[PDB]
Paper text:
As a segmented negative-sense single-stranded RNA virus (sNSRV), arenavirus encodes a large polymerase (L) to form a ribonucleoprotein complex (RNP) together with the genomic-length RNA encapsidated by viral nucleoprotein (NP) and facilitate virus replication and transcription. Arenavirus also encodes a RING finger Z matrix protein as a regulator of RNA synthesis. Previous studies have shown that the arenavirus Z protein forms a species-specific complex with the L protein and inhibits RNA synthesis initiation by impairing the catalytic activity of the L protein, which is known to be essential for the balance of infection and further initiation of virion assembly; however, the mechanism remains unclear.
After motion correction, contrast transfer function (CTF) estimation, iterative rounds of 2D classification, and heterogeneous 3D refinement, a total of 405,657 particles remained in two classes representing the individual L and the L–Z complex, respectively. [name]-L displays a similar architecture to LASV and MACV-L proteins, with r.m.s.d of 1.882 and 2.729 for 1,282 and 1,110 aligned Cα atoms, respectively, which is consistent with their relatively high amino acid similarities. We assigned residues to [name]-L domains as follows: residues 1–190 belong to the endonuclease (endoN) domain; a linker region spans residues 200–259; residues 260–705 belong to a PA-C-like domain; residues 706–1,600 belong to the RdRp core; residues 1,601–1,814 belong to a PB2-like domain, in which residues 1,601–1,727 and 1,799–1,814 belong to the Thumbing ring domain; and residues 1,728–1,798 are a lid domain. The RdRp region is caught in the middle by the PA-like domain, where the PA-C-like region tightly binds to the Thumb domain of the RdRp region and the endoN domain is on the other side.
Residue numbers in the entry: 1 to 190, 200 to 306, 315 to 355, 370 to 400, 411 to 465, 472 to 506, 524 to 784, 832 to 847, ...
Write the structure that this text describes.
């Protein structure tokens, strides 16, 4: 009591720093005794300590006097009346800028990150107002996770909080009791299943806990279940000869399949059989394949580089014109003394002007200012100002050169200069099969559309002419719109030749230099299909077909062309297979338009008739491999969402359709209203009511078989406005194309959407506030209503608009408040109802993933809910770890799945490679709750609890609130208003109509959700058990138990022999079995998809197909990915990603010769970026299959072992000696002394002298390669340290990598930034330096001992030897992968500890936490900051099984 008060009073002024502001509160704290005053004073002072401590740490003046942002502005004389009311903790005002500090200390990660995000939002809210006011904000907040501060030592404040803690308990004993703010204090600091909350579970968690027991008998005996199965069957079978449907499951006659495929689309694709006819149609389909097959046939051009480099500084209408005189002038002193697209002088910005609008812009810009006297008045000032951007940031020698061309300008020369060159089909030679220059023109008519996002805003014939380079002759483009949007391009040649078409540049990266990879992919393919029936003249037929197909697919990329060629895998899987759904041929049909797509149809049918036509069962394996690969040929299209909005409406629709047929209850409340209880009552009642003849596609579980399942697990047998309307209304008669007006009317979602509170609603609303800016606008609309009456005292929309807007006006007409930013956390769990944890109710939001076929749904929710959901998704994971069938993240189980699959398939037993359908929207947390609160787990107080925590996190998920994404609701309201003002309305367009007759939807909340991926381990658990039960029903009825597996949305069922003899013997039984397994799954929530099969030789478990024995390689699958995945990074890492993906590729059977070609393509891309190819950039382009038994180390060593062939012959026996005498008896530390890494690399000399024989200074000094990251990393502290710290569009990536890597990127010893150009030329021309190439410039072949005026600028200090970086590597490669890496032709914590074993960097590597030779290899890795010798195996997973062509293990070194 009194003793603690006295202790505090004597502790505040005797142990805390004496500050002017702190004293004000210190004295008042000392002057009180009553507990409530003591607490408030102590808490406030504890707040102020951190407040001013962090404000001074930032250096921004603290807001002690509670000065407002407006006050902070006005104390400096800045008058901006009207601003968001904010009270920054620390502020520093300057002439035109502001620094605001918001500070807070939070213990729990969740509350910390929360307060972080809304503090960022609060700062960003006033961003535009601060900017337009003439100042700017310094964005910064002080997120501290501790109380250590300058004003007090740690022990002082720690004991302080202890005393306040104990005095809280004393006060809580007294009548200072606080309802739950007492909790927010105390447990707010004075994972694993937080149970410290109260329990308010009343009158709702009892009905829900009752429906899970009303009807079920979870204890049935061990032989009272058999009698139930035998009476659920044979009550089905006898209702199959008349009742439902013949099983949806029929057999296959391959000819029937092929003919049914052929007769698809009776309408327009109507059996155009003749090959030549099809190809003739093909070569004429779009407008672009009409060129790709057509058979057509430096003083300037550098001045643009200079005229362009000085362009990013300024860009205005008055500019870019006299920036073009400096170019047209250059076009007259080079043709008179003697490109140009015939009226157009290619000006700065890829722009193109008219030679006649110029030469008339002057003479009225110049004349407004004796014209010949007025000559040179601007052509000289421009030179002077551009040269004003001098060696300032290294303005290079290009400057005086222009002083020769430009000053030749005269008004007797600009009388005709543009008047001199006054000059303002093709066909389709089809024989362009197999002609490498028919794709080699795509590989250059895409780079002229790809490097076209690289234009800028830049404000007739104003057309952004790029250049189609090619051998010698060059064409153009002509378009008018930039960005990543669509526009109508053109081409131009020597004759006009408007080959107009319409495409999207983002889609065209795949062929951007790949002319020799595709032509060998499509050539290897046809090396599989050298088959006996086709040896007649059809190989040419197939070859022309396949090439004319790949051309269409690359040349006309679009979603349908992907979904189609993807679906053509199901048909072939069926043709080789032996049963199949009967509703299949409606799983293949699209709405083909755009004759390209129809011709793709015809080509596919031609391929299928040819290969799968007569003479079957002779080489079907090869034909199957061929065709599945042609199926995967779909990946060549980019997976990048053709449009955004029309790919959000689709995702929302795919979410919201089943809810249309079940129930939804738009926009619930935070407190579950009676209506929600009624609707959930009804939905549970229906969900548990599904008779023994199910509607076959609707969510439901039948409480007569569900009882059997739960009871067979519990038994031990299956184991082992008044302003809104007015604002729109006044402007309506103030705004009087009209589609902008339609937008204006559809901007009306303010008198219909005002939901939630929090953050729901996400510019002209504020613009009218500043636009009007009149005297009295914030009171009632009395004046506004007066104008409307006094006014009246493509036009119908205006009158009904006044009718609507007149309609609108008629119908429309204390706690720790300050210490909130301080230790007190406002929100946190407390007493929780059965709906939610009292802070919220498990909010969510959905967006689409990006995939090949169809965009897949994704649920993303804020971090607290992502913390809670982790508890369920881990409890169920640990649960299923006891059962041995699932395979989702149990990776060790996948290998056994593969082994069993192979042992099965090898013999001829079935594989019912099913795939379930609508797995997202046909599962409900209710079902897992039913399944759990009915299981009978063992002894209590350690299982019996945590069950009542999983089964109350689930009950939380039940009532989630997904969000209607804002663009979707905007679009649907547009559609509604368009329809109403002025059919084809899909179902989800009518619900908006009813509700917007009343109130808008915002949130949707229903039982059948199972957020895709959210509970994706709970789903796996359920599926595993259900399959383990159905494969018991089938066992008791028919007589065999077929094993299964699962992924959470895939499956398999490897029936044994006794259920495989029947298909050959009698299919009329196994047909019934595949009907019954498809029926019970219907009773439960498992709906088998029509894409399933039961192939006696085929399989498909998570996309790893099979054939008798071996695996279908899926060549095109991996090639299509390696040719992608080129991301903007450091090229020494961009070429790491590919050297991983190529190892992945050669894991499966991509042949080595295509791998080299992929690598050559990537190197060629870099070389196009103008980036020197130092020998460590991308791996050897001469590879044995040696991707096995070799790390990246071995490739790079092998490269240096041939880029300098006989120098690296001595430094390989020196290393032999070093390794011979390092492991056994010596160095092990003194080698770090001889590493000498502090100083220069004479180490080679002293270390050759140390133990070994003659070694000249040549083999060391001579080979020396330019290295860009020598002294610092280059702009856009070792490497392995950064990686360990890290373990605490794609065609607008390249179009950026080629922009930054050419500019000032490299850095110097004194933070100086240089180009690659000057640095790469000086080493070649301006020294006794020899800089010749070997396919990669190993600059400065000599650098004699580096005896020189060293550090000239940088180009001599900036280049390190080679035969040393060969030594350190060719050592690291000798403990990691054996001894032979010299002879002539493990995990994170470890590495952290052996990094600590030299403790100096641990001081930086430690605080981010909230063997025999490994020391040496870690050292060598830490020094060599370029590749990976250790840090590799901890970033990129290697592969386990390797098989590649046996004709590559024969050509080996
Ligand atoms: Mn599958």
């Amino acid at each position: 009591m009194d003793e603690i008060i006295s202790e505090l009073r004597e502790l505040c002024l005797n142990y805390i720093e004496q500050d002017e502001r702190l004293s004000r509160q210190k004295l008042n704290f000392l002057g009180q005794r009553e507990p409530r005053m003591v607490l408030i004073e102590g808490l406030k002072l504890l707040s102020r300590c951190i407040e001013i401590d962090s404000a001074d740490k930032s250096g921004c003046t603290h807001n002690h006097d509670d000065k407002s942002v407006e006050t902070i502005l006005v104390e400096s004389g800045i008058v901006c009346p009207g601003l968001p009311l904010i009270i920054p903790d620390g502020y520093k005002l300057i002439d035109n800028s502001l620094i605001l500090l918001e500070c807070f200390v939070r213990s729990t990660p969740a509350s910390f990150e929360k307060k972080f995000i809304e503090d960022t939002n609060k700062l960003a809210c006033i961003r535009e107002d601060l900017a337009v006011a003439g100042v700017t904000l310094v964005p910064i907040v002080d997120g501290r996770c501790d109380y250590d501060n300058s004003f007090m030592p740690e022990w002082a404040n720690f004991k302080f909080r202890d005393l306040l803690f104990k005095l809280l308990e004393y006060s809580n004993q007294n009548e200072k009791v606080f309802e739950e703010s007492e909790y927010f204090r105390l447990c707010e600091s004075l994972m694993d299943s937080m149970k410290i909350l109260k329990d308010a579970r009343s009158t709702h968690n009892d009905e829900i806990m009752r429906m899970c027991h009303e009807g079920i008998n979870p204890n049935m005996s061990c032989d009272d279940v058999v009698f139930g199965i035998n009476s659920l069957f044979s009550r089905f079978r006898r209702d199959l000869e008349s009742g439902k449907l013949k099983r949806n499951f029929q057999k296959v006659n391959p000819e029937g399949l092929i003919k049914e495929f052929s007769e698809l689309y009776e309408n327009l694709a109507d059996s155009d059989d003749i090959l030549t006819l099809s190809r003739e149609a093909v070569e004429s389909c779009p407008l672009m394949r009409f060129i790709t097959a057509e058979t057509h046939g430096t003083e300037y051009e550098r001045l643009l580089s200079m005229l362009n480099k000085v362009k990013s500084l300024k860009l205005l209408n008055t500019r870019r014109r006299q920036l073009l005189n400096l170019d047209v002038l250059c076009l007259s002193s080079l043709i008179k003394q003697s490109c140009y697209s015939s009226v157009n002088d290619r000006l700065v910005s890829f722009h193109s002007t008219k030679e006649e609008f110029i030469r008339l812009l002057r003479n009225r810009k110049k004349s407004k200012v004796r014209a010949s006297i007025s000559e040179f008045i601007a052509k000289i000032q421009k030179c002077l100002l551009v040269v004003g951007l001098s060696f300032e940031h290294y303005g290079l020698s290009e400057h005086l050169e222009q002083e020769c061309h430009i000053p030749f300008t005269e008004f007797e020369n600009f009388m005709k200069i543009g008047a001199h060159p006054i000059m303002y089909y093709n066909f389709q030679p089809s024989t362009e099969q197999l002609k490498n220059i028919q794709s080699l023109r795509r590989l250059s008519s895409v780079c002229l559309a790809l490097t076209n996002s690289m234009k800028t805003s830049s404000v007739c014939k104003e057309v952004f002419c790029q250049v189609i380079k090619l051998d010698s002759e060059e064409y153009h483009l002509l378009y008018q719109k930039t960005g990543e949007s669509s526009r109508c391009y053109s081409i131009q040649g020597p004759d006009g030749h408007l080959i107009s078409f319409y495409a999207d540049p983002k889609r065209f990266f795949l062929p951007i230099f790949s002319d020799e990879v595709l032509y060998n992919m499509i050539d290897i393919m046809i090396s599989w299909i050298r088959s006996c029936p086709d040896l007649k003249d059809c190989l040419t037929d197939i070859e022309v077909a396949l090439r004319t197909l790949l051309l269409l697919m690359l040349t006309n990329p679009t979603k349908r062309n992907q979904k189609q060629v993807q679906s053509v895998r199901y048909l072939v899987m069926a043709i080789v297979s032996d049963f199949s759904s009967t509703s299949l041929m409606d799983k293949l049909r699209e709405d083909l338009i755009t004759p390209a797509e129809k011709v793709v149809y015809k080509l596919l049918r031609f391929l299928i008739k040819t290969i799968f036509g007569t003479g079957e069962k002779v080489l079907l394996s090869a034909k199957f491999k061929f065709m599945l690969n042609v199926s995967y040929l779909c990946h060549l299209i980019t997976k990048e969402t053709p449009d955004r909005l029309t790919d959000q409406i689709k995702c929302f629709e795919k979410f919201f359709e089943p809810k249309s047929q079940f129930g939804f209850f738009v926009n619930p409340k935070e407190a579950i209203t009676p209506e929600e209880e009624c609707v959930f009552y009804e939905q549970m009642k229906r969900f548990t009511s599904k008779e023994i003849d199910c509607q076959h596609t609707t969510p439901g579980v039948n409480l007569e078989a569900f009882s059997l399942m739960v009871s067979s697990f519990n038994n031990g047998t299956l184991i082992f406005l008044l302003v809104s309307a007015v604002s729109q209304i006044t402007e309506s008669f103030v705004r009087k194309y009209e589609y902008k007006v339609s937008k204006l009317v559809s901007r009306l979602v303010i008198g219909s959407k005002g939901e939630e509170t929090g953050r729901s609603e996400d510019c002209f609303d504020g613009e009218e506030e500043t636009s009007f800016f009149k005297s009295l606008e914030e009171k009632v609309n009395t004046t506004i209503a007066r104008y409307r009456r006094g006014r009246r005292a493509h036009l119908q929309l205006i009158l009904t608009g006044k009718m609507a807007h007149l309609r609108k006006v008629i119908l429309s007409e204390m706690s720790a408040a300050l210490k909130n930013l301080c230790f007190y956390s406002e929100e946190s769990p407390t007493s929780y109802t059965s709906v939610g944890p009292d802070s919220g109710r498990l909010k969510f939001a959905l967006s689409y993933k990006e995939q090949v076929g169809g965009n897949r749904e994704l649920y993303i929710g804020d971090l607290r809910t992502k913390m809670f959901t982790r508890l369920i998704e881990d409890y169920f994971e640990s649960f299923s770890s006891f059962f041995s069938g699932s395979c989702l993240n149990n990776d060790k189980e996948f290998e056994n799945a593969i082994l069993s699959m192979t042992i099965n398939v090898r013999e001829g037993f079935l594989n019912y490679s099913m795939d379930h359908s609508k797995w997202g929207p046909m599962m409900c947390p209710f079902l897992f709750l039913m399944f759990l609160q009915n299981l009978k787990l063992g002894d209590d107080q350690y299982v019996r609890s945590g069950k009542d925590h999983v089964s109350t996190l689930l009950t939380w998920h039940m009532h989630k609130l997904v969000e209607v994404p804002f663009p979707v609701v905007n679009a649907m309201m547009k559609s509604y208003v368009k329809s109403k003002l002025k059919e084809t309305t899909v179902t989800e367009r009518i619900f908006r109509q009813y509700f917007e007759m009343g109130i808008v939807p915002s949130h949707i909340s229903s039982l059948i959700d199972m957020g895709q991926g959210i509970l994706h381990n709970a789903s796996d658990f359920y599926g595993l058990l259900s399959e383990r039960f159905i494969n018991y029903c089938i066992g008791v009825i028919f007589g065999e138990r077929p094993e299964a597996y699962t992924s959470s949305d895939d499956q398999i069922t490897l029936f044994d022999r006794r259920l495989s003899d029947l298909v050959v013997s009698d299919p009329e039984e196994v047909l019934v079995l595949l009907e019954f397994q498809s029926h019970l799954s219907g009773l439960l929530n498992k709906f088998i998809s029509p894409k399933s099969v039961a192939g006696r030789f085929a399989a498909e478990f998570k996309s790893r197909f099979y054939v008798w024995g071996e695996e279908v390689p899926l060549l095109t699958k991996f090639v299509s990915a390696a040719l992608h995945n080129v991301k903007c990074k450091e090229p020494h890492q961009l070429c790491e990603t590919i050297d991983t993906i190529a190892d992945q590729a050669i894991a499966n059977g991509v042949p080595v010769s295509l791998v080299n070609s992929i690598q050559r393509r990537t190197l060629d891309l870099l070389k196009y970026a103008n980036f020197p190819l130092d020998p460590f950039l991308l791996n050897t382009n001469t590879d044995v299959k040696d991707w096995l038994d070799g790390s990246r180390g071995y490739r790079i060593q092998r490269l240096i072992e041939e880029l300098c062939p006989n120098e690296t012959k001595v430094v390989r026996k020196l290393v032999r000696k070093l390794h011979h005498k390092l492991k056994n008896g010596e160095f092990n530390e003194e080698f770090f002394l001889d590493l000498f890494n502090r100083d220069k690399k004479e180490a080679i000399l002293q270390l050759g002298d140390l133990l070994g024989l003659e070694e000249d200074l040549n083999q060391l000094a001579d080979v020396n390669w330019l290295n860009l990251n020598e002294m610092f990393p280059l702009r856009m502290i070792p490497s392995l340290i950064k990686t360990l710290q890290n373990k605490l569009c794609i065609s607008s990536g390249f179009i950026g990598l080629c922009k930054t890597l050419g500019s000032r990127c490299v850095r110097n010893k004194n933070r100086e930034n240089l180009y690659i150009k000057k640095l790469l030329e000086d080493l070649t021309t301006d020294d006794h330096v020899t800089r010749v190439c070997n396919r990669d410039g190993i600059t400065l072949y000599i650098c004699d001992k580096q005896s020189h005026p060293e550090a000239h600028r940088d180009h001599i200090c900036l280049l390190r030897p080679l035969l040393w970086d060969y030594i350190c590597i060719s050592l690291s490669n000798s403990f990691e992968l054996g001894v032979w890496v010299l002879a002539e032709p493990k995990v994170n914590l470890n590495q952290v500890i052996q990094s600590v074993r030299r403790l100096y960097p641990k001081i930086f590597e430690d605080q981010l936490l909230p063997i025999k030779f490994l020391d040496l290899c870690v050292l060598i890795d830490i020094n060599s900051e370029s590749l990976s010798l250790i840090s590799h195996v901890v970033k990129w997973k290697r592969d386990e099984h390797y098989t590649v062509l046996f004709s590559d293990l024969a050509n080996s070194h």
